[PDB]
Design a binder for this molecule. Structure first.
Ligand SMILES: CCCCCCCCCCCCCCCCCC(=O)OC[C@H](COP(=O)(O)OCCN)OC(=O)CCCCCCCCCCCCCCCCC
Ligand SMILES: CCCCCCCCCCCCCCCCCC(=O)OC[C@H](COP(=O)(O)OCCN)OC(=O)CCCCCCCCCCCCCCCCC
Ligand SMILES: CCCCCCCCCCCCCCCCCCCC
Ligand SMILES: CCCCCCCCCCCCCCCCCCCC
Ligand SMILES: CCCCCCCCCCCCCCCCCCCC
Lengths: 100, 54, 102, 162, 478
């Protein structure tokens, strides 16, 4: 009753929005937020694809995807806390000491 | 006229082009994370556009 | 059918009536009546431990509803999973990550 | 059933667009939680009951709690975040939005050229996910436990105070 | 698919590395002993390496819908285990100067090795994704293990953000492929199509996004910009692991993906990979010209060498010796990078505090460290593809494979990039031999590792037949 292409288009829209939020924001926190949006959109795409074929592999890939999302969020927020501790700011333009 | 060995300079020309191209390519390594994300997205656009064209 | 759509209508009515009840409770409260330190890192640590062990708990949630269908093979696999989980928990306890008192 | 899908998808898109453009981190995280609830409703409209259950349990109930906790610990009372509004300048966001719109156009053009018989929405219960999770996909389960242990050790080592 | 005990025999190195992770973590929970935990980690990695023989006795088969074990899997499991053992050996003298905790390093190295083994045995998109993340997240920890150092924290943040973005791209591409195909197995990606309908747009777009994620992980142009920054900022044993084991395991699973998939011989995907390989070779050689820092130079070197490997990968569907060429080149590049990054690790060990530098200062090394200078100059000659070195044998294999499949643009790219590489590698070597103004057995073990790598490179450069014989012996399931 729901077209597969509609669910895939919804997932693509959310992935594109997450990527835009990851690019346009100097704050490290909003970059992590955009990463969470992107990985959740990819997991949503896996669920849509699994529900189309009637297979249980889509929700398995969702489970692995949100395990990755949880662990990456944990690591990224620990790094954010360390950056805020030792530099007292979260602007990512200032973290550019290696170049060339 | 020839005492500076012009053919040697004509064969040294590719080294000059290689140094200039390397200096031009090193401007992408500015050290900014947002530019690295942007370059990844640009390359994704380029790869997907090439796959759709071909 | 009719029983499942009746239960769907009942659940939808339940959700909207409860939400509307709390919303109009605040609306009546706001409408009636006259008018005249350094944050320690242990909180992040325990929140992250909650996140990780909640994902492992989700795996065990999936296993628990189909224990008979997976058999003793699934029991061995889940025992390995739970043993790795408990080894991580013992590690976190022993390195003082879960000790709050000095 | 399709009405639930379309309404929740619209809410998810709008909430995500409000997330990436807002300046206050708490309101951005609240909009993100709203989008996660909308995506869970999308999952429930597609028969993936376990996926929607974990979308509210884990993604909206554990990960966003961690983000909220970090935002609290940062003590953001206007600490070089609210004052700038640099991303709203068109010279900053027009380029990346154009790039992401081009990427969206290419992906949607790829998606629209696929064979589509529709999603029947037959409920795939958590019993089937548990059967296939501890059957064919069980090395994935054990190594996902190892992945979570890796994230645990990494985040503990980085995020200590001393 | 169920698991028989013979399938557990085929599961042996994964099981031994996982049990090593559990045992090392329980030993850390007992008491923080650096020497005991390092010994347990290297004992577990050696046990997996020698259990590869019992895996070879079992035979090639499939343990799951996910894992397939064969000679290909054994070869890349061995390469990953060798890189992990070398990383632990280099990490001990560097960690002796680290005033904070030291054993979480070995725990993360073990987990990353487990991810590499899973990528070696992978036959499924789920196993591919899980192996990539299982490699990437311990690398998030290890790249910023010295997070008090500014450059290490910078490299950790950059690698974490960019690798999460790449994993999102890879996951979304796999989701689109699964939407088109309906099966996540490698052999069923494009199987439902036929008779010229292979270039389906959703399948190609999903493979494109997967290519974006994988080419991030393989430091391929234009997903290459992180590599010098992360290689420079990371600790030197972490740079060793990230240059060797991650690239080797991910390129092995990419070889499996493009070998088994019916869409892997698509003309559009072949042309896109040709463009990526050409740009990778040329750009990674051109950007390493004016590099005065050895870490960034080796990062651009990694870009160029992965481009050469990609050239070998493009001719996989046309030729037949492409798998053999990739195996020989991967062994040569493994030993070359192990020696080079090991010399860098030994001269940067012990870790002299977070507030001090971590520079190598390669000028005039021979007059106080002659053996390390000899090893480093052999490694620089090997990375240049100069004969009497194993890197030349790899480059010869790549050129033979490219000539066999009429990939003339890639052949010219290899020639030009090899000349540019000759320039900067020779500059590094003569800087070693110019003029400039330890005391424990683990530093001696690191020196023995880089010396054995140098001897292997020289001997297998002048006599490459044993390596070719053991690489042709590793055939996957046709
Ligand atoms: C008959 C023509 C047709 C057939 C051609 C067949 C190809 C093989 C035979 C021709 C090869 C020509 C290559 C010429 C290279 C010259 C390199 C050189 O002179 O290097 C020395 C120079 C270092 O000295 P200096 O200038 O002081 O340094 C500046 C900062 N270090 O170094 C530098 O300044 C930088 C060096 C950069 C790297 C070396 C240059 C590589 C250029 C591409 C190599 C492949 C060329 C292919 C053919 C092109 C057309 C001839
Ligand atoms: C604004 C308020 C929220 C609006 C979105 C959610 C409600 C949309 C309307 C749902 C109406 C009920 C409906 O469509 O039921 C159909 C189906 C019932 O289940 P099924 O067994 O598939 O039935 C088909 C044949 N029996 O339904 C389903 O299968 C799925 C039922 C809906 C999904 C669960 C609820 C999602 C709630 C999301 C809230 C998001 C946050 C909202 C915030 C609002 C303020 C900003
Ligand atoms: C200080 C430099 C910050 C750069 C941020 C990233 C800008 C990327 C712009 C890409 C535009 C592409 C348009 C098509
Ligand atoms: C060809 C492959 C590599 C072979 C070995 C390379 C050299 C290894 C080290 C041997 C000893 C070198 C001694 C150099 C002395 C330089 C003296 C200069 C005086 C002006
Ligand atoms: C900078 C690298 C230049 C490489 C040139 C390679 C030229 C190959 C020409 C192939 C022609 C094939 C015709 C059929």
């Amino acid at each position: 009753m729901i077209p597969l292409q509609h669910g895939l288009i919804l997932a693509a829209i959310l992935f594109v929005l997450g990527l835009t939020g990851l690019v346009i924001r100097r704050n490290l926190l909003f970059m992590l937020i955009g990463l969470e949006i992107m990985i959740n959109a990819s997991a949503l795409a896996f669920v849509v694809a699994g529900s189309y074929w009637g297979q249980t592999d889509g929700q398995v890939m969702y489970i692995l995807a949100i395990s990755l999302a949880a662990a990456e969020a944990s690591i990224g927020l620990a790094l954010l806390l360390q950056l805020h501790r030792r530099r007292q700011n979260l602007n990512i333009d200032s973290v550019s000491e290696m170049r060339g | 006229l020839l005492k500076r060995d012009p053919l040697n300079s004509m064969m040294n020309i590719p080294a000059v082009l290689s140094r200039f191209a390397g200096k031009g390519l090193l401007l992408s390594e500015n050290g900014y994370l947002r530019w690295y994300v942007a370059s990844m997205s640009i390359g994704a656009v380029v790869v997907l556009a090439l796959l759709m064209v071909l | 059918s009719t029983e499942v759509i009746a239960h769907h209508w009942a659940f939808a009515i339940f959700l909207i009536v409860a939400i509307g009840l709390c919303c109009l409770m605040l609306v009546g409260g706001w409408f009636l009546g006259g008018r005249a330190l350094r944050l320690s890192a242990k909180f992040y640590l325990v929140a992250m431990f909650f996140v990780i062990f909640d994902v492992e708990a989700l795996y065990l949630f999936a296993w628990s509803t189909s224990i008979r269908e997976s058999g003793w093979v699934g029991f061995v696999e889940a025992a390995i999973f739970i043993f790795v989980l408990l080894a991580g928990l013992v590690y976190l306890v022993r390195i003082g990550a879960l000790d709050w008192t000095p | 059933m399709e009405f639930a899908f379309y309404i929740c998808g619209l809410i998810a898109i709008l909430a995500t667009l409000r997330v990436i453009t807002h300046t206050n981190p708490v309101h951005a995280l609240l909009y993100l939680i709203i989008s996660l609830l909308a995506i869970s409703g999308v999952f429930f409209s597609l028969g993936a009951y376990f996926a929607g259950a974990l979308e509210i349990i884990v993604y909206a109930g554990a990960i966003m709690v961690l983000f909220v906790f970090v935002v609290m610990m940062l003590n953001l009372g206007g600490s070089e975040i609210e004052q700038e509004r640099q991303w709203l300048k068109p010279q900053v966001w027009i380029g990346p939005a154009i790039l992401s719109a081009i990427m969206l156009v290419v992906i949607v053009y790829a998606i629209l050229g696929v064979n589509d018989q529709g999603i029947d929405g037959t409920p795939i219960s958590a019993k089937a996910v548990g059967i296939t999770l501890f059957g064919p996909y069980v090395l994935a389960v054990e190594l996902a436990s190892m992945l979570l242990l890796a994230g645990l050790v990494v985040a503990f080592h980085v995020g200590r105070e001393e | 698919m169920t698991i028989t005990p013979q399938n557990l025999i085929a599961l042996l190195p994964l099981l031994i590395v996982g049990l090593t992770v559990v045992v090392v973590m329980l030993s850390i929970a007992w008491r923080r002993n650096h020497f005991l935990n390092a010994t347990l980690s290297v004992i577990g990695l050696n046990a997996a390496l020698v259990s590869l023989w019992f895996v070879g006795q079992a035979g090639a088969m499939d343990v799951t819908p996910l894992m397939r074990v064969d000679g290909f899997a054994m070869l890349y499991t061995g390469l990953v285990l060798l890189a992990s053992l070398a990383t632990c050996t280099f990490a001990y003298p560097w960690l002796e100067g680290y005033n904070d905790n030291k054993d979480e390093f070995y725990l993360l190295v073990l987990i990353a090795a487990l991810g590499g083994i899973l990528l070696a045995n992978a036959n499924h998109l789920a196993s591919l994704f899980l192996g990539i993340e299982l490699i990437s997240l311990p690398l998030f920890g290890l790249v910023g293990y010295a997070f008090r150092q500014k450059r290490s924290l910078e490299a950790s943040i950059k690698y974490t953000i960019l690798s999460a973005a790449a994993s999102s791209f890879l996951l979304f591409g796999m989701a689109l492929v699964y939407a088109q195909s309906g099966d996540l197995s490698f052999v069923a990606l494009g199987k439902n199509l036929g008779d010229g309908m292979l270039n389906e747009p959703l399948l190609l777009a999903g493979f494109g996004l997967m290519i974006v994620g994988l080419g991030f992980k393989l430091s391929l142009v234009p997903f290459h910009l992180w590599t010098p920054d992360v290689y420079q900022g990371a600790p030197a044993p972490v740079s060793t692991f990230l240059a060797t084991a991650s690239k080797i395991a991910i390129f092995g699973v990419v070889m499996r993906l493009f070998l088994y998939a019916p869409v892997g011989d698509s003309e559009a995907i072949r042309v896109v990979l040709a463009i990526i390989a050409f740009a990778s070779i040329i750009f990674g050689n051109l950007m390493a010209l004016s590099q005065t820092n050895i870490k960034r130079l080796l990062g651009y070197s990694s870009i160029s060498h992965l481009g050469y490997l990609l050239v070998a990968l493009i001719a996989l569907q046309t030729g037949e010796m492409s798998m053999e060429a990739v195996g020989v080149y991967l062994a040569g590049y493994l030993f070359s990078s192990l020696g080079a990054f090991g010399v860098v690790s030994l001269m940067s060990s012990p870790y002299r505090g977070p507030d001090a530098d971590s520079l190598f200062s390669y000028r005039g090394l021979f007059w106080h460290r002659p053996i390390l200078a000899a090893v480093m100059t052999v490694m620089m000659l090997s990375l240049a593809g100069i004969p009497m070195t194993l890197g030349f044998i790899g480059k010869f294999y790549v050129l033979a494979v490219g000539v066999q499949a009429h990939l003339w643009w890639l052949v010219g790219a290899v020639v030009v990039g090899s000349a540019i590489g000759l320039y900067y590698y020779l500059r590094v070597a003569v800087s070693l031999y110019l003029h400039a103004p330890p005391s424990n057995w683990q530093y001696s073990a690191g020196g023995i590792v880089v010396l054995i790598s140098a001897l292997l490179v020289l001997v297998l450069g002048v006599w490459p037949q044993p390596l070719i014989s053991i690489v042709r012996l590793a055939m996957p399931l046709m």
